[PDB]
Amino acid sequence: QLFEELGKGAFSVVRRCMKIPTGQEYAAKIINTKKLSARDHQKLEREARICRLLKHPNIVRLHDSISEFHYLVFDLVTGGELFEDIVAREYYSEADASHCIQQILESVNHCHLNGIVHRDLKPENLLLASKSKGAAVKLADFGLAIEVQGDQQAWFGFAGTPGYLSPEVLRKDPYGKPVDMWACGVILYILLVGYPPFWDEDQHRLYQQIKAGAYDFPSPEWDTVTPEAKDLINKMLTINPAKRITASEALKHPWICQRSTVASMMHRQETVDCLKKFNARRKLKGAILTTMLATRNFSARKQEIIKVTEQLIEAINNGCFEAYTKICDPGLTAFEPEALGNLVEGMDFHRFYFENALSKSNKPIHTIILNPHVHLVGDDAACIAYIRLTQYMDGSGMPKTMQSEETRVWHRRDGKWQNVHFHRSGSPTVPIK
Amino acid sequence: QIKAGAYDFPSPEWDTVTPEAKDLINKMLTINPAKRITASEALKHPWICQRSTVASMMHRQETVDCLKKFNARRKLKGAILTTMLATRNFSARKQEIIKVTEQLIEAINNGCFEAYTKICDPGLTAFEPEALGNLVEGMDFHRFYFENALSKSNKPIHTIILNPHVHLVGDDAACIAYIRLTQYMDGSGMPKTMQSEETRVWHRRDGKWQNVHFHRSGSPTVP
Amino acid sequence: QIKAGAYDFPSPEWDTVTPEAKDLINKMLTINPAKRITASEALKHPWICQRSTVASMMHRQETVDCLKKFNARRKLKGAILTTMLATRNFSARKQEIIKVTEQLIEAINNGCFEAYTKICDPGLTAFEPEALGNLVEGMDFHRFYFENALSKSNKPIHTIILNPHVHLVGDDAACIAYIRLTQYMDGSGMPKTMQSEETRVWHRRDGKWQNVHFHRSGSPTVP
Amino acid sequence: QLFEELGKGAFSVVRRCMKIPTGQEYAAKIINTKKLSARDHQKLEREARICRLLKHPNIVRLHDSISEFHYLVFDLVTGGELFEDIVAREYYSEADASHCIQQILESVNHCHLNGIVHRDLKPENLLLASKSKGAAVKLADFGLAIEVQGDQQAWFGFAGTPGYLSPEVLRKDPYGKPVDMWACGVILYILLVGYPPFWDEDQHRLYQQIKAGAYDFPSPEWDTVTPEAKDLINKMLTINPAKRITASEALKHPWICQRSTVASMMHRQETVDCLKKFNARRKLKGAILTTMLATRNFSARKQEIIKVTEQLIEAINNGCFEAYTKICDPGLTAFEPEALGNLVEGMDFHRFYFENALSKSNKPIHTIILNPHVHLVGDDAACIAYIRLTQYMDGSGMPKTMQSEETRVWHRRDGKWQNVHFHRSGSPTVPIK
């Protein structure tokens, strides 16, 4: 018996309903037929099967999958996010956090016992059954969950949320149940002090922190945290998944199964305050759509590559072939529109333009380098990618603009950055008009 | 910072600089050019014309060490060519504009006209290829694509927002410019991509960022 | 006006309306919907349920005469179809944006880069056909057309600004959208016309309206 | 001997210079060769000849036209606009205004005596020689001036500034010297109270006011103006140019040649205040470029034409041919893309679409009318012009938009607005895609 609307999925409409014969209410996620994309149906089939398999008080339960118009009727959950509820409480201590993690571990342990790995443990998937006092924690959203065979590890793909990704996934190693336990470690850390153990504006460095297990317990906020809580975090945030504590073992860790004896009950106002900022940053960085932002900040090492690339392009515009042969490797290779799809090698092909075009007369050239992106691939190697915009005067006297996309590979040889390969697509770089 | 003359003399390095040297800097860095010391006057400043008695003769190694870094950065940033770098370190205010913009795009992709009319100002104007070079006003022109295509067509589309740039033009106004890349399935079931460039002007009215004008160039958003 | 509840009961016509009728209006036109009278409550208002003793029985000919005009206007404005009328009655604030926009266009046509850099913000961004779908930043990209074509070419051009629409988005921010019609002489000496659609975002900084972003679609401004 | 820059012309650069042998300074308007357009050179030749002919203390004098790079060396004028100087004074009376008009009339009388009509008398062309106390008024900018033969009237074209245009020009009658005197009347009126005698947001109604000579002297500001000042204005703002006072006669009007006896010396603060607003509106409405703004405000009569046009288009979209034949004249003619450049007459050509297209099935049509412009050509006649935007579903199922431009001519026949002709350009109005 439908009622109010709760929200929207990508393809579905969530609405409150009822089991009329028993006056027990539910939430209905209508499958509909808005789209039916390929991996959209393959995933939905998977999610329904998995949710159907898991029957546990701390996991959102699926109660039917009617295909009258097709349905996904779940438990009514009205408590919102655990993290949002915590910031609203007047008192919040380690003991409160332990009680939460115990329920999360129970849900994770249930998944693993049934050969299911969630892969996306994070605050958004930790809900409260209702706004009631002792409402249970419920694990939600198995859209990324996988079915594993016993304890066999395998490469199931690079999936998850950056801040919670495990080292084994970032290493491209086969993985399994332990990835959920690494995520639990990140979550517990946040539950105690209200900020994440791994954070960096640069995603690549974030992943380096995770792989190296480079977190710490800075003073003063961690000085009041019990040794047992720190110990559990260390056992979850263990780089080697074979040495990482399991859900079963974590349920019997003193901080969990002896919460009433070792967990501190001191109110942690600083944690509540920080968690409020954490939730606000999270809601603001939701990234509803795929958002790509070209690297504006640059390390000195990356600036070095931009500089030498601009020096090379300047030698070209000025027709300085001496500079060009200093900067380019003698075995340079290139793809470029002027080469008609062939890979050219050496200097000869490029010397033709230095000899017959790069010393034009009253013909001003202005080059603009747009959104350069630099990869550092070892101490002596890099590649750079950028848009090359050229403003110039055409034959009929009018100003015109052309665009190229350029990749250049750099190797530090004999102490000097040298260009061993480049690839240009789009327009030629000499005004052909 | 420059227009506000917002500089200071932080400790410790400036604790050992003479008052007269700080004084000369102050008189040169005077916001009002009418009150700024001239070249003739500075040549008569005690720190300049009585250096022997006024200027310190202490060694400033920390100035040498810092100048080395200053020079190194200056030679690295030496742009031989015009270089245009995107924006990637956004304030919270600018991220707010990005978020509501993506919420608006999401509502369009999902054909949710209720969300669209919530986020867009009733007096919205628009330049877009669908409008054939005309400036359209109100929600009518856009209602057609919701009531028909945006929900009628059942094909997968993926939107990408590239290189957003946000101008904050007052506490309650903002401008955002971005490239809108759309992947979709064509009639023959083949994957295609199209590009639009889009400007959206935002005004915070009644505590809610609302879109008062937008300008699309390039491809039309409906495949 | 509606959001502010900015209505009143002007004299003389309202001098003869009962207090109870004014009271019922006040309770219905309550800005906060939580405090607005409900239908059940209004049915118990003295002016409604005790009409015989509360409501006036005087003839309101001036209401009949005014309703006749109200009805006539309502039947004339009855838009059978979506009608979009330009703007032609501009406030002084909106005319200010039109003026500085035309000053900017004039500087471009005359190849006066000094005026251009005076009116444009140093951090100006732009989408324009000359930029091939890229967002360009700064004055560099535009400097090329001043240093060469805008003054080099000696041919007559006439610019027309059609149907400007100005959004005021705060005391120090504005948006303008207009069609830019350009008549010019082509290479063969034949007259031609081209059209662009242009959005310009303006921010009043240091007491001067300055262009922080613009978006051109259609033809490129250089012939 | 060049010095400072004063401003820019469309094609020229104005800069202070000097006559070095005599230490007398000037202003130099460089002709250059920035453009040399057809009617640009024909006008410059005219302006130089005219300025060369006029030698009078109250007219900007041309002193050379060198062609080394070509020059237009004028008198150095540094006093700015008369109207700007007046608002800055502490005391300003009729007598001050009369002294100004006497100088203007002297310059105008000089022009007419030499067979030259300025045609563009207005505040911007009334300058002060310098910022000195009794600096002379100087008439400037003969870019619209014409050379007349004696007292022969002719049609020299529709030229001038709207607020100052004479009735004879607005009537498309042959004209001559008197147009300058009508302008002087408008200028004098403004000099006394600080607002124009003719003003209307709608230019067409402005011109109707001018042609009808519909100005007045409202109280209280005009109650303190002398009868002689009003009399002079009336003699200048005389509709019939043959009865309009001439510059010669105006110089001998009591308010001019008896200023010291009949002109009031009372300070007119309200005039200074209003003139400041007048100058501010003028500087803001400069219209640097040709600006066109579609009529937003509409009279009830014009609204009637929009309504019946929208009723007609609705009958088309709904395929109501009964309504169509009610609204359209039986002798309707049309140009339209569907007719391939032919003029079609009657109803038959249009009935084909009512019978075979205007009753489509699940094919939504949405019409938008953009920027309608209505001309009222008599009480029973009008034409309307608008953009017609049609949104529709194409054959392949996709939404599309097409544009037409439409003119419709309306005649009130037997008390009913009826469409006797229409012209459509652009796309056809039935989805051909």
Q: Write the DSSP string, D408-433.
A: EEEEEETTEEEEEEEEEEES-SS---
Selecting among A75, A85, A120, A180, the annotated active-site residue is A120
Residue C65: is it exposed, middle or buried by C-beta count within 10 angstroms (0-12/13-18/19+)? exposed
Cα–Cα distance between A397 and A362 in angstroms, integer?
Answer: 11
Which residues on adjacent β-strands are paired with residue D407? D385, D423
Tracing tokens 């060469």 back to the chain, one arrives at C148
Identify the closest residue of chain D to C154 by CA–CA distance.
D35
Query: With contact defined as beta carbons under 8 Å apart, do D177 and D112 qualify?
Result: yes
Name the phi and psi angles at D376, rounded to 5: -95, 115
**Is D328 in contact with D312 (CB distance < 8 Å)?**
yes
How many Cα neighbours within 13 Å face the side chain of D91?
A: 6
Element at D369 (helix H, strand E)? strand D365-376
Judge whether C93 is closer than 8 Å to chain B, CB to CB.
Answer: no
Amino acid at A365: I
Sheet of B136-137, strand order:
A290-292, B157-168, B173-185, B191-205, B208-218, B120-127, B136-137
Instruction: Return residues 397-416 of D near B (CB < 8 Å).
Output: 397-399, 401-403
Chain D residues within 8 A of C80 when measuring between CB atoms: 307, 310-311, 313-314
Cβ-based contacts of B165 with chain C (< 8 Å): 125, 135, 137, 213
A103 close to A58: Cβ distance less than 8 angstroms? yes
Q: Is B3 on the interface with C (CB under 8 A)?
A: yes
* Burial of B185 (C-beta count, 10 Å sphere; 0-12/13-18/19+): middle
Q: Per DSSP, which regions of A223-364 are E strands?
A: 290-292, 328-335, 344-345
Binary contact (C177, B127; C-beta < 8 A):
yes
* D387 at interface of B, judged by CB pairs closer than 8 A: yes
| CA dist C67 → C29, C56, C76, D38, D357 (Å) | 21, 19, 14, 60, 42
The phi, psi pair for B175, rounded to 5°, reads: -130, 140
Using the Cα atoms of residue B43, residue B47, residue B53 and residue B58 in order, give the sign of their dihedral.
negative
Question: Which of B80, B84, B159 is opposite residue A289, by nearest beta carbon?
Answer: B159
Amino acid code (one letter) for B110: N
**Chain B residue with minimal CA distance to C121?**
B167
**First vs last C-alpha separation in chain D:** 70
Return the active site residues of D. 120
Nearest CA in chain D to C150: D34
Secondary structure (DSSP) of A70-101: ---EEE---S-BHHHHHHH-S---HHHHHHHH
What φ, ψ does residue A426 adopt, rounded to 5°?
Answer: 90, -135
- A363 inside 8 A of chain C by CB: no
Residues facing residue C177 across a β-bridge = C165, C199
Three-state DSSP at C98 gives helix
Work out the minimum CA distance from B118 to partner chain C, whole angstroms.
16
Measure the CA–CA gap between A347 and A78, rounded to whole angstroms. Answer: 69
Query: Hunting for tokens 């000037």 — which residue is that?
Result: D26
Q: CB–CB of C170 and B173 under 8 A?
A: yes
Handedness of CA D103, D107, D112, D117 (dihedral sign): negative
* β-strand partners of C27: none
Instruction: Give A112's contacts (C-beta < 8 A, 6+ positions apart).
Output: A177, A180, A246, A247
Q: Which residues of B fall within a CB distance of 8 Å from A303? A: 76-77
Quote the tokens at residue A99. Answer: 């009680």
Query: How many CA atoms are closer than 13 Å to the CA of B60, on its beta-carbon side?
Result: 15
Chains A and D touch (3+ CB pairs under 8 A): no
Residue A116, both tokens: 């299911």
Element spanning A7, H or E: strand A5-8
Q: Which residues pair with C195 in a beta bridge?
A: C181
Active site residue A202: no
Give which of D269, D279, D259 is closest to D224, Cα–Cα: D269
**Which residue does chain D place closest to B221, by CA atoms?**
D399
* Helices A178-193 & A269-284 angle (0-180, nearest 10): 120
| Ramachandran angles phi, psi of A242, nearest 5° | -70, -20
User: CA B105: distance to chain centroid?
Assistant: 20
Q: Do B135 and C170 touch (CB under 8 A)?
A: no
Q: Chain B closest CA to C178's CA: distance in Å?
A: 8
Distances (CA, A) of A139 to A17, A63, A105, A124: 21, 16, 10, 9
Residues in a beta bridge with A359: none
Tell me how far apart the alpha carbons of residues B173 and D324 are, in angstroms, rounded to a whole number: 49
Q: How far is CA D402 from the centre of its chain?
A: 35
User: The tokens 């199209």 sit on which residue?
Assistant: B194
DSSP 3-state of D271: helix
Cα D303 from Cα A415, distance rounded (Å) = 80
- Which chain D residues touch B148 with a CB distance below 8 Å? 364, 393, 399
For chain D positions 292-331, those within 8 Å of chain B (CB to CB) are: none
What approach was used to elucidate this structure?
A: X-ray
Structure tokens at A240: 């080697």
| Cβ distance of A401 and C131 shorter than 8 Å | yes
> B–C: how many Cβ contacts below 8 A?
120
| Residues in chain D closer than 8 A to B140 (CB atoms) | 366, 368
Q: Measure the CA angle with vertex D221, ends D218 and D223; round to 5°.
A: 80
The resolution, in angstroms to one decimal, equals 2.3
Interface check D396 vs B, CB under 8 A: yes
Structural contact between residues A19 and A64, judged by C-beta atoms closer than 8 angstroms: no
Distance (Å, rounded) from C-alpha A14 to C-alpha B171?
36
Tokens of A57: 């008080």
In the structure encoding, which two tokens stand for residue B8, read together?
């200071």
CB contact under 8 A, B132 and D403: yes
Q: Write down the H helix ranges in A201-343.
A: 203-211, 227-236, 247-251, 254-257, 259-262, 269-284, 300-317, 321-327
Instruction: Look up residue A59 and give its DSSP letter.
Output: B
Report the distance separating Cα D98 and Cα A46, nearest Å.
95
Which residue ranges of A make up the annotated binding site for ATP?
29
Backbone angles phi, psi at B133, to 5 degrees: 80, 5
Q: Mapping DSSP to helix (H, G, I), strand (E, B) and coil, where does residue A324 land?
A: helix
Nearest-10 Cα torsion for D116, D117, D123, D127: 0
Instruction: List the 122-181 stretch of C: residues with Cβ below 8 A of A.
Output: 130-132, 134, 136, 140-141, 144-145, 147-149, 152-153
Burial of A5 (0-12, 13-18, 19+ CB in 10 A): exposed
Q: How many CB atoms lie within 10 A of CB A72?
A: 21
Phi/psi for D189 (5° steps) reads: -50, -50
Could you tell me whether strands A416-426 and A328-335 are parallel, antiparallel, or unpaired per DSSP bridges? parallel
